[PDB]
Structures are given as structure tokens and as C-alpha cells.
Structure 1
Amino acid sequence: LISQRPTLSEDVLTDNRSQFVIEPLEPGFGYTLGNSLRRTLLSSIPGAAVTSIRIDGVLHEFTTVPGVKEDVTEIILNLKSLVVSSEEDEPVTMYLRKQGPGEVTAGDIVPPAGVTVHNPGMHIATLNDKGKLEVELVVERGRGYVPAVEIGRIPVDSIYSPVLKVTYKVDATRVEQRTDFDKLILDVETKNSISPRDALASAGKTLVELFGLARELNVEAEGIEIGP
């Protein structure tokens, strides 16, 4: 048969985070596309990030780096939060070298051709008097999240997904004759690589292809709609 008026609207919280509402859905389909959209947003969007880092002078003792107050653990934590977009499929190495007492920022890194650092004002470490920091970075594209995978180089947890946090909920908004229809609320928070709008659009395209895989099976009758 036919069911119509499934509109989609967006409430903008921040530039990197938004809520979307898909309403109204039949008593099905509230939870069918609920978890699938979230898992797609999380695992299916391509994005580039760090894989491994190597810092000199810290090789055998990973506990502390002289000249800086932060430990190596805090350095890796700060470094995993860096947002980067790379066009090269093969891995690309960057370098960050800064001397003298002060504060290192993401802008102090020199991006090789094709890669872009989206948050220059991010904090990495602070250099003590007569301090110097030299660190190699490995950046490559991927999807989702993967744990730690030349001696002196350590792997990190790679956060490839351009989206950070996605949560969903379902609520009833139907007609008085029904009062049971589902409605989907999606809270999505993404990195500076893309807006939540583009993340949702890419997830929709990928899932359209996924399901489309099935449609090609018979290309036959199914529930029609009015507005897309």
C-alpha cells in the first residue's frame, strides 16, 4: 500500500553537533532504522586519522619525556584528538618539531601535501626551559575505530570516524485514530571534518546502496511514499 508524510527536520545545537527528527513512522520502522543509522554513522563514514607515533629520547622508557611536563600517555591522548583529512590512500607521515620553553599547538605541525589539520588551536604539550620536542606522526584513511595494531614507534588507537557520539530514541506521535506511530530522534556529534548534515547524508547514501542491493533482487512492489 501507500504511507506518506515522513518528514525530516533538524535542530542545530552547535556547528559540530545537531539533533535530527524523522517523523512520523508507522508502528514498525521506528527501531528498524534506529540502530542501523547509528551504526552506519559510526562505522561507515570514511575519515583519516593517526595510526602510530615515534618520539626520540623516549624509546626504552615510555613513562616520561624530558623537557615537557605531560607524560607520554597524555601526549597520546592529546594526539588522538587531532582531526585531519588526508587524500592519499597510502600512509602519510607528518612531523612536529618545536624548541624553547613555551606551548606547542597543532598549528606548529607542518602538514605534508594533501593532509589538513582542522584544529590549529589544540593543545599538545608545554616545553620547559631549554626544552625541545620532535615527534613523527602517521596519518591514513579508514573507517570507524580500531585499537592499537622500526623500534621506537608505538601504535595508537585510530579514531577514523568523523562523527564522535551518536545516540537515538523513539517516541510516539501518531494520529488520534492510531496514537502509536514511531518517531526517531537522533543526537549526533561530529568532528570538524564534516557537519552532522553531511554525515547523515553519507550514511543515507551508503545505506541506500546496501538496501538497494536487495531491491535489485526483484525490483518489485513495496511501500510507496509522497515526500523524499
Structure 2
Amino acid sequence: MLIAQRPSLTEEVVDEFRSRFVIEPLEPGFGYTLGNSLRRTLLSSIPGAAVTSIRIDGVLHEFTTVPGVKEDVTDLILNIKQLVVSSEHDEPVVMYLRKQGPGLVTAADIAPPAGVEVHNPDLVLATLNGKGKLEMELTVERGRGYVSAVQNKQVGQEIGRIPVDSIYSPVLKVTYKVEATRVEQRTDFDKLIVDVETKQAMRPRDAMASAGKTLVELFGLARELNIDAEGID
């Protein structure tokens, strides 16, 4: 009844943010269950914070141009959503960015409010020609998973404000592949290899620890039905 060989999660690091996780020989047919549940929970269930709206001075929602900046508004939207923010206010919070003169405006030069931290100051947001004139305020809100952009009537409240897509999940992707391994003359053992790509804010192994605890709680909710024993170790 007991599993012939107990699994054991192991780690293989190729970069400070990219990592690989292997499960040793596992019971036959259990690779896909664990692999796909882990992928989805890791991509979605973990919480985080990311921007939700942006406001640019002297610009309308239909007016896609911004004076004083060579770059356009859509690439600016892409760059801001790329930026990672760690927030804990649990309510919408605004962050300001005011800069003039020609040069480059980067995440380093952003001034964050109290209790909100920008993990990556290296990213360049805009390039200025002539007088910069750049004034911008962006809202940050903690969230879970991934939410597409929607209209909250903020454009009606203020014409400059526009929606933007958000990445609440600390992780960027998970690509799990399952292969067969031979144990004690038997080939009916599945090895699961999970490749987690995460942003610089969170270490991937902590993200999988959180995902595993979430899954453990969610499935141990099923223990309430009845106490039963299954062969293990």
C-alpha cells in the first residue's frame, strides 16, 4: 500500500530569478495532477501588487500624444505595467512622478509614498527632448492573480486617467513537463520538472512554498468529510 519511493522536491538554479524544480519518482499517473495544479496555483493564487491606472498631465484619453516626450503613450503603458511594485495598503494608493528638463526618467527617480516600495529602479520609463514637462501620477493596488483592464469611470472623473492591465501574480510563467523514470526495474514512475520564471521582487522557491501551502489548505478542507488513512512513506 505504501508508495515504493517517497518523492522529494529538489531545486536547480540557473539565475537569481529563473529556477527549475524536480520531483523524484512519483506514483504512476500522479505527475499531471500535481503538475497542472501547481502551475495554475503558482500563476494565480499567490497575491501581489501592481499598477491599476495612470494619469498624465495635459492629455485626454483620445489624445494619445503627450507633449515634451519623444515616446508615445502605448509604449509608456507597456513600460509602467512592466514595473513591479510591492504594496500592502490593501486600498488604492497613488504614486507621483514629476520631472522636467531633457534626459531620461527612470524608476529610480520615481518618489514612492510611505509603505510602498519599487523593487527595480533601473527601468527607464521615458526619454525627454527639450523641456521634459513630464508630470504623472499612477495608482497602485494590491491584488491576486491577473486582471485585465476595465473602465472604472476614472476617465469620467478625470479625463487624463486611463485604465491599464495589471500583473498581481509575482510569477511570470510556469512550464511543467513530465517524463518517465525507471525505478526498481519498473518504468511506471513519473518525474515532474517545473520551470518557474519570477520577477525580481519574489524568490521563486518562496512562491512555490506559498502555492503549496495554499493547495494544502484547499485540499485539506476535504478532510472535514471524514478521517481516513492512505499508504504513504
* TM-score class, shorter: over 0.9
**TM-score, normalised with respect to structure 2:** 0.93
Deviations 1:179-210 (A, max 9, x none): 12101000001112210110000000000001
**TM-score, normalised with respect to structure 1:** 0.95
Q: Which residue of 1 aligns with 2:129?
A: 128
- Following the alignment from structure 1 to structure 2, what is the Cα–Cα distance between the partners of residues 34 and 77? 31
- Following the alignment from structure 1 to structure 2, what is the Cα–Cα distance between the partners of residues 100 and 184? 54
Q: Which residue of 1 aligns with 2:167?
A: 159
Report the secondary structure of 1:120's partner residue: coil
- Following the alignment from structure 1 to structure 2, what is the Cα–Cα distance between the partners of residues 81 and 219? 47
Deviations 1:64-120 (A, max 9, x none): 111111110000000001111111101111001111000001011111111100000
Aligned residue pairs, count: 225
Q: Which residue of 2 aligns with 1:215?
A: 223
- Following the alignment from structure 1 to structure 2, what is the Cα–Cα distance between the partners of residues 135 and 162? 25
8 Å Cα contact 1:12/1:19 also seen in 2: yes
Matched, 1:112 2:113: yes
Q: Which residue of 1 aligns with 2:153?
A: none
Stretches of structure 1 that go unaligned for 5 or more consecutive residues are none
Q: Percent identity?
A: 82
Report the secondary structure of 2:188's partner residue: coil
The RMSD of aligned alpha carbons is 1.1
Q: Which residue of 2 aligns with 1:20?
A: 21
- Following the alignment from structure 1 to structure 2, what is the Cα–Cα distance between the partners of residues 92 and 179? 55
Moved more, 172-181 or 29-38: 172-181
8 Å Cα contact 1:62/1:72 also seen in 2: no
What amino acid sits opposite 2:168 in the alignment? Y
Deviation at 1:60, TM superposition (A): 4.6
What amino acid sits opposite 1:93 in the alignment? V
8 Å Cα contact 2:61/2:161 also seen in 1: no
Return closer, same or farther for 1:105/1:22 CA change in 2, 3 Å cut-off. same
Q: Which residue of 2 aligns with 1:179?
A: 187
Report the secondary structure of 2:121's partner residue: coil
Stretches of structure 2 that go unaligned for 5 or more consecutive residues are 151-156
What amino acid sits opposite 1:200 in the alignment? M
Which structure has the highest helix share of the two?
Answer: 2
Q: Which residue of 1 aligns with 2:141?
A: 140
